[PDB]
């Protein structure tokens, strides 16, 4: 993330972090249940084989409650393709259940119609991660959060060089130096309604990070709720 | 209005049926006796920041 704040303890407990063979964080994830993690499909090409870390809040000091889980099954969207970043979604089912604690608590899946009229109509949502701290910058050590206004789809489309499919949406800022960045990809964009935080997007892509006149592009989750449901029932 | 006004006062999901408002709740919540508020079925419900 570029800009924003740092997540006080227990305020971003649905954050997961995928870690490679070198036990190093390269993509985010979102905890959906004791057993399921939500992520971006393209993060699967950024590592040969990986694991998931919950409750981490700083890479140097062990805060007690961190814990790492093996992935049992990967359900990658069939129609994801590398050249367009369409369908940038995948779900992981673990070999072991994450046990909820202080700082690991799942984020909510909504019901599609209500989310689309009530969640996607809110002014902003909340993105988070350990990803780089500036556009050509270094990966962050401590976990950070960011409030990103929803950017309407028309203005979005006009700001970008590439196609913005309906399985994507815009959030962030025109000129202001705040955005997600590489290493945050796959992690959570949640929208709050009456003090509950529902998964509304996956960090997917963007033109640079914080670029002036460019926003962040997220997998539109509601467009994939049914597919997510079916993955949990197969 | 119905779902337009305070979400039909549902806490979470609001859906229209029978030209009236029908609340639901997310998994790990159950809908209260009053048909709108949502009660946690467990100690770590989804979408809730952890406190001490």
């Amino acid at each position, epitope marked *: 993330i570029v800009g924003g704040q740092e997540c006080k303890d227990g305020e971003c407990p649905w954050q997961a972090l995928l870690i490679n063979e070198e036990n190093e964080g390269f993509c985010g994830g979102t905890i959906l249940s004791e057993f399921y993690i939500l992520t971006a499909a393209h993060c699967l090409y950024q590592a040969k084989r990986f694991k998931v870390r919950v409750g981490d809040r700083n890479t140097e000091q062990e805060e007690g409650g961190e814990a790492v889980h093996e992935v049992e099954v990967v359900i990658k969207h069939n129609r994801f393709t590398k050249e367009t970043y369409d369908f940038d979604i995948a779900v992981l089912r673990l070999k072991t259940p994450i046990t909820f604690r202080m700082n690991v608590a799942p984020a909510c899946l909504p019901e599609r119609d209500w989310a689309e009229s009530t969640l996607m109509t809110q002014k902003t949502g909340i993105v988070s991660g350990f990803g780089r701290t500036h556009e050509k910058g270094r990966q962050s050590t401590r976990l950070k959060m960011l409030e990103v206004p929803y950017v309407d789809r028309n203005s979005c489309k006009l700001s970008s060089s590439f196609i913005i499919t309906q399985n994507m949406f815009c959030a962030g800022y025109d000129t202001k130096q705040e955005d997600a960045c590489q290493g945050d990809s796959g992690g959570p964009h949640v929208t709050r309604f009456k003090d509950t935080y529902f998964v509304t997007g996956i960090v997917s892509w963007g033109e640079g990070c914080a670029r002036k006149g460019k926003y962040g592009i997220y997998t539109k989750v509601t467009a994939f709720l049914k597919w997510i449901d079916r993955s949990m029932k197969t | 209005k119905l779902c337009s006004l305070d979400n039909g006062d549902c806490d979470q999901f609001c859906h229209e049926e029978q030209n009236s408002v029908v609340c639901s709740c997310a998994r790990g919540y159950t809908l209260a006796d009053n048909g709108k508020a949502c009660i946690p079925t*467990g100690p770590y419900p989804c979408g809730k920041q952890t406190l001490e």
Partner: antibody
Amino acid sequence: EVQLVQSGAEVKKPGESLRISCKGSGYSFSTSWIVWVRQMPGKGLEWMGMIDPSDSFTSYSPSFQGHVTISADKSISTAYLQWSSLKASDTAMYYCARLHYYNSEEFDVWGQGTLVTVSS
Amino acid sequence: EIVLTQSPGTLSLSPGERATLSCRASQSVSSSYLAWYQQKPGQAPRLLIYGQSSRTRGIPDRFSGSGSGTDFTLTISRLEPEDFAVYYCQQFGDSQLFTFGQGTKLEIKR
């Protein structure tokens, strides 16, 4: 009040077809899978299959596939269980029950049951 | 597919006592945790408790569940006249769908 209400007891002969119904009220029917459950007389519960009423997607128990049909009519919030050709062994109580969506593994609301009798 | 074997077939107890019902599952390559149901004569099954630690609304805190892997139990701390019935465990695996135990009859020891 959310309810599942099933149609009443049926009495049929082998070889006849039959359709029983299961009506949801007090919630959006489309938003939950609807499962059917068998209970042979004096016996235990048997899961038969389920349907997603939003798109009528169905999944049958292998033990029951080809012997029964699950269907739905979302305009009237009703699910159905149908046999083209009954056997005496279909004599049992049949329940409908709601299966939530993303991560449910259990049935929160049950219909009152439908008694099915198959006999010459 | 996971076959669930509950035990005992019939449990004979007195009002006031604590009850323990077993269910053992083939913890396959997946598995997880189980849901449990109560059923009284002439009534539909009723969901009591489920998942790692969820409870249906209205279930008194005398009802609790535990176990993991292949071994699970449900415990009732203090039996009420209204508590005597058949109990079913129920599993799901993602690839494996749903299965039930064979039931335990909770009867009054007199």
